From a paper:
FzmM and CreE catalyze the triple N-hydroxylation of L-aspartate to nitrosuccinate. The crystal structure of Streptomyces sp. V2 L-aspartate N-hydroxylase outlines a characteristic helical domain wedged between two dinucleotide-binding domains. Together with NADPH and FAD, a cluster of conserved arginine residues forms the catalytic core at the domain interface. The Lineweaver-Burk plot of the initial rates revealed a pattern of lines intercepting on the horizontal axis, suggestive of a ternary complex mechanism. Thus, Streptomyces sp. V2 L-aspartate N-hydroxylase operates as a typical class B flavoenzyme monooxygenase: it is a single-component enzyme that binds simultaneously FAD and NADPH and retains the pyridine nucleotide coenzyme throughout the catalytic process.
The enzyme was originally crystallized in conditions where the sole precipitant in the reservoir solution was ammonium sulfate. Expectedly, the protein structure is populated with sulfate ions. Two of these sulfates were found juxtaposed to the FAD and embedded by an arginine-rich site, establishing H-bond interactions with Arg266, Arg409, Arg412, Asn413, and Arg416. Notably, these residues belong to the helical substrate-binding domain. Being negatively charged molecules, we speculated that these ions occupy the putative position of the substrate and therefore inhibit the protein. Consistently, we found that the enzyme loses 50% of its activity already at 5 mM SO42- and becomes completely inhibited at 10 mM concentration. Interestingly, this effect is specific for sulfate because chloride (up to 100 mM) and phosphate (up to 50 mM) salts did not affect the enzyme. This finding highlighted the bound sulfate ions as likely substrate mimics and the associated Arg cluster as the putative site for L-aspartate binding. The crystal structure of the enzyme with NADP+ was hence solved at 2.5 Å resolution. The active site is in a cleft at the interface of the three domains and both FAD and NADP+ are clearly defined by the electron density. We noticed a difference in the conformation of this side chain between the sulfate and L-aspartate bound structures. Its side chain is oriented “inwards” in the sulfate complex to partially occupy the catalytic site.
Author numbering: 2 to 601
Write the structure that this text describes.
Amino acid sequence: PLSVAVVGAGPRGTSVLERLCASAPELLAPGVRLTVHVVDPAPPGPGRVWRTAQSEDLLMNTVASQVTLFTDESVNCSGPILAGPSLHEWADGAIGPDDYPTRALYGRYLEWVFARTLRHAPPSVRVETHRARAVRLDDAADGRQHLALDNGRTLTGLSAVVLAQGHLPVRPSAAVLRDTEHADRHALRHIPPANPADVDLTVISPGEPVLLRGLGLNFFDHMALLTTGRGGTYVREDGVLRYVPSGREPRVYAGSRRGLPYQARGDNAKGPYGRHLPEVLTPEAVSAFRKRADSGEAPDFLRDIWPLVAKEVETVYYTALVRHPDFAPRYLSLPYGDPQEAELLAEFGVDADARWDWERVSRPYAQREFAHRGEWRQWLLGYLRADAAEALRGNVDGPLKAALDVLRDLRNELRLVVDHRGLRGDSRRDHLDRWYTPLNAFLSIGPPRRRIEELTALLEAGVVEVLGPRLEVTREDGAWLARSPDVPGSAVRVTTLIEARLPEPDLGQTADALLAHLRETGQCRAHVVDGYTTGGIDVSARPYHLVDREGVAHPRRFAFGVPTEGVHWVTAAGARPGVDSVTLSDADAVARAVLRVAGQ
Ligand SMILES: Cc1cc2nc3c(=O)[nH]c(=O)nc-3n(C[C@H](O)[C@H](O)[C@H](O)COP(=O)(O)OP(=O)(O)OC[C@H]3O[C@@H](n4cnc5c(N)ncnc54)[C@H](O)[C@@H]3O)c2cc1C
Ligand SMILES: NC(=O)c1ccc[n+]([C@@H]2O[C@H](COP(=O)([O-])OP(=O)(O)OC[C@H]3O[C@@H](n4cnc5c(N)ncnc54)[C@H](OP(=O)(O)O)[C@@H]3O)[C@@H](O)[C@H]2O)c1
């Protein structure tokens, strides 16, 4: 009997399964029965990340109305549109449309979408689930696929295999290996990069000095598990929030190179579907860059693309500030940085000190010197109160927060520019990977306003201290010493060091047995751009055929999602409804390429 496999049953593998079911009526000759083998060690639909068993203190950073696993009439794909409830719609009042659902609520949704997909499967499709890890993929002698499972079963005679493996484990770095040995030598707790939901924090005693290294979204997970996750609660009084300790909290210290928590997402004022539509980095501009890349002279991010992005962000900021319909047409007609930008801003009455400054935005303390921890704390509380305030204004009327949400709304235009060798190698390395991606994340992939407010209250209550910029950490006899060179008197010896970040996809250092087998036998390879290696797994153009060390696109092997980071930009994001989501059209294209290779 005809047979294919999907490796991974998270949102992406679940979506491949739903799109297979959708197009199998059209693409399988009548009377043909296809078995789809779905393989995941975690219960299928949510997979590992979204599993319903995890702690309820952990949130999504997407509002509930903007999360789906269903196609809609806006999705440009060849498969049939099969409409279904968004997270919000399904949750039946459990969560508001502009509120952040718990990860377990998204799990309960994903669980239901898996079960529904099975119930609605056409007669031509039989689904077989496997509570196992796939560990080897090989060509059989005839060119069909053998997939070996860790439970001793082997799947043979496979027409196609889809790898939707998502957030894979990575070998500990050199730094993380030293810091873990140090914990072993002096009985300390080292927690290496991980989903915060996957870590055991119960070994951290009340009052323990802990360093959270990292101030992004992993940091806010840990912040919550070590406070509200231990009996802590908040109380709102005359608008302002207050933390009510349980007495079980550690003494939490945090820091990073930048020294700042990620910016609050402006409160959504764009409803479920609305966004800033591109007016500088436009489809027309993106076609011009694709053409230059295909004819072998790819653009430079910093010289060619950044100026278009900065112009959009600055334009939306000043449009929200001036609120005059004549303004934006005149500001858009000017090249980025032209002397007339200033003259026009002056004409519409914008003081030289409300002007935009990428230096203030990324390094808002940089004018300022800190005599001790207390000056740093007073400045930081000022900063976080101003961030919360700005986010309350929302992503339409709030000048700053609408401007920064542009960075979110340009993701698809930027994907189309940089993806599949769209940049010179040296630019991808020095401009995108090592500057823009992290800045972007700081500015536009931060937490809900609520979490900034909470952190503000936790600083006031003394439960959490943020150390300061350029976090230094040293192994010392019996502890780690953490300080900020920019904040005298911030030295503190901790006995728990938590790396508050996810492992970044790295094929080179993968801990997944299956990808390691494929790498070592030359059946996949790191995606390389002009001599820069990304450790994404290399794939072809949609529908993303796996590429081997010889440069051959495998007709029977597809890869889709986080492991392809480098080929694709910001793969760690879900599907949005009503905005021609590329996750859903990618899934449709993969499903039809699989059905086609099976029905010859
Ligand atoms: C902590 C965290 C929070 C996030 N929050 C958000 C958010 O709020 N909003 C958002 O849009 N995105 C969020 N994301 C991004 C996330 O990448 C996507 O939402 C989505 O989970 C990606 O789907 P996926 O199937 O590609 O990957 P995953 O969700 O990682 O699924 C991969 C699945 O494949 C399985 N698998 C891997 N290797 C094998 C193997 N060899 N054999 C069998 N099974 C295997 C795993 O067990 C897992 O179930 C978050 C990610 C993380 C880690
Ligand atoms: N709330 C949620 O839904 C949630 C939770 C977790 C993760 N996620 C998803 O996963 C992605 C990654 O999250 P993340 O927290 O790992 O990344 P992140 O949000 O970018 O936070 C990473 C932090 O680590 C710091 N950092 C990293 N390596 C460091 C080092 N060696 N030394 C010092 N500081 C270091 C970075 O700051 P500096 O660069 O300034 O040092 C930054 O402050 C998100 O973008 C999102 O898609 C979502």
